[PDB]
Design a binder for this molecule. Sequence first.
Ligand SMILES: Nc1ncnc2c1ncn2[C@@H]1O[C@H](CSCC[C@H](N)C(=O)O)[C@@H](O)[C@H]1O
Ligand SMILES: Nc1ncnc2c1ncn2[C@@H]1O[C@H](CSCC[C@H](N)C(=O)O)[C@@H](O)[C@H]1O
Ligand SMILES: [Zn+2]
Ligand SMILES: [Zn+2]
Ligand SMILES: [Zn+2]
Lengths: 279, 425
Amino acid sequence: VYPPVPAEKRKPIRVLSLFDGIATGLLVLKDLGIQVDRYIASEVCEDSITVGMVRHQGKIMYVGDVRSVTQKHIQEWGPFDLVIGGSPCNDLSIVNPARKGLYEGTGRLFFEFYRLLHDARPKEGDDRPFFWLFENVVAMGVSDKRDISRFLESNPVMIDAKEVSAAHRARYFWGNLPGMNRPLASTVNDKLELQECLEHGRIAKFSKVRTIQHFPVFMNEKEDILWCTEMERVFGFPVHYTDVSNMSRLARQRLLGRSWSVPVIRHLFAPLKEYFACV
Amino acid sequence: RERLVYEVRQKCRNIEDICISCGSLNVTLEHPLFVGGMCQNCKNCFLECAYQYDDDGYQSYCTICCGGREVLMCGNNNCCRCFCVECVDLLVGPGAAQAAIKEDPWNCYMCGHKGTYGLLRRREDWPSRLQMFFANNHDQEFDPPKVYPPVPAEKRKPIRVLSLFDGIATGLLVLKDLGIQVDRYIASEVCEDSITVGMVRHQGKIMYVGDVRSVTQKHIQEWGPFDLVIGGSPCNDLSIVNPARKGLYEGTGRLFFEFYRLLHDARPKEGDDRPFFWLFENVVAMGVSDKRDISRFLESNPVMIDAKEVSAAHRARYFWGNLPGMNRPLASTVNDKLELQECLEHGRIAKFSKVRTIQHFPVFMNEKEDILWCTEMERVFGFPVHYTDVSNMSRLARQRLLGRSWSVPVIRHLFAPLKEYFACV
Ligand SMILES: Nc1ncnc2c1ncn2[C@@H]1O[C@H](CSCC[C@H](N)C(=O)O)[C@@H](O)[C@H]1O
Ligand SMILES: Nc1ncnc2c1ncn2[C@@H]1O[C@H](CSCC[C@H](N)C(=O)O)[C@@H](O)[C@H]1O
Ligand SMILES: [Zn+2]
Ligand SMILES: [Zn+2]
Ligand SMILES: [Zn+2]
């Protein structure tokens, strides 16, 4: 536990964000009104790059693959105040029909986070505030979870988004952010019922959508999928967030599906306001 | 015309006494863009052909004669004109076309910086003459539309609209933007995506009908008196942009009459002097006898309105109707974006200032050639941001859906004096 820095002394936060996806982290930091000095992001999927580019207005400095980031890169891109990331979950999740393996691909990429975390960490005796967050799914192996806990040298917190959002999104969060254990509060802006997240003219038999009776909606006495803008509303994203480039619906749903739940991430990132500068 | 222009350059015949399109001696008009006379058959050809563009975004035929077998496309940015080899042999000289092919950065004669050549010289008020040229269509003489006296403000009531070929509910959207109270908005449409767009964006208010051909006069009577009937025939088959142009009169022409029928069904009787208004829309790249038959049946003179005046698209459209002030000039408000660049997303730069939609991919982003994004196509046509992102549809379909639609500030311009006849929010 690092002691709080006085308000006049606070500075803009610097974030290294691995497996950034659609820039949920920076978006949440903006929503909290924290000044962001810089936001370095590694990602490989072009659609997600584009989403971040447009929605965050060129501010994000885009890097390539995480495996091309050296310790020299970490040093020359300035000291980092917050390192965040979530390993690929599509291969760990049981939803993908082609489950060739779980430890392959995703597990290797985990260590990449691990490496860069140590690269971004201040030395002992440098008592400057430094924070990190790793995210993963709950449907994972026990020895896998143990090895992750061993390497990050911490105990996981399971947080389920149902407490604050209209999705069943149970996720592990390792990290040293203050108040990562405390209970989740749902603000009035958050929508605990699926029906509030639907478009007008639609009615939901479901109150929650399970995403980690396939088609959740009865509209005009017919069974339909949630629309992309509603999937955004379920996860807490701003309205029409992923409509940037010309991409197919299947891809755009997939893109939204991988992402972090916005009010959960707001809940986690909120006490960082006590350590950095405000807008 | 080779021997006749031989006598023209020998100072024995005036170029203004000869039809520079086909060499006819039956000179009635002057050519609107360049020096010479113009015969009536060439006027009909010019009406059909001038604003016809190929799939490359350049003109389908020569700009001069509206024919030509092999054409010269123009190098200058945003210019889409073509000049066939035959025309250049008279006006610039023999072999000038074959020599002009070899000039790799070439500018066409509407874009030439000098503006003055030997036999061909560009006439100075050509945009004014282009605007006058449609007023020059007095062959289809018709009586002026009946002007209805303004209803006092306290007496005004909410407008009722019958909207055929509604598409994505551009009309109701514009009426909302003008702040006119809408009692009801009956709409016929058949494409499910467009139905959905209207449903969501206009919040269940729209009462959806099926095919226009299932709407009877009894239907028209029992759905209450209508104050405004609007519509635009399918333009995809009339447009030269669709590769599969099987016909022009088939499909689209038949559906035109549907509008015609329901218009008469919705019209008040003589002696019923209640205000009533109607609008029909169509493309400029259409047949002359087609345009005549349309003018004959709607018993009116078309107004051509080009969206370039108020928006970032070349969208030249005919508007028949009796709305007051349909002839008056178009004003572009500060909210409207006359440059393509203002309509782009951040991080993108447009070499183009206008997009021609009636160098295929209009955008240089990160030193690469890309299509406009769907939300930008919405911004080009004046639609609200993220207007067509309702259901889960493909990009090709969603672009197509946007492409057919009416230009929003043009429709705002047309619908604006209806505020003097109906109730406000
Ligand atoms: N080698 C690699 N380097 C960086 N990102 C990668 C990668 N391989 C896969 N990814 C990306 O890692 C992401 C994992 S899920 C990302 C969730 C993210 N927090 C969000 O809010 O969207 C995927 O988007 C995938 O595109
Ligand atoms: N039989 C029919 N009845 C009603 N609409 C039809 C039809 N056949 C085709 N259409 C529709 O007519 C439209 C012509 S273009 C529509 C433009 C409209 N003003 C807009 O703003 O979108 C197309 O959307 C097409 O889907
Ligand atoms: Zn002629
Ligand atoms: Zn020609
Ligand atoms: Zn030119």
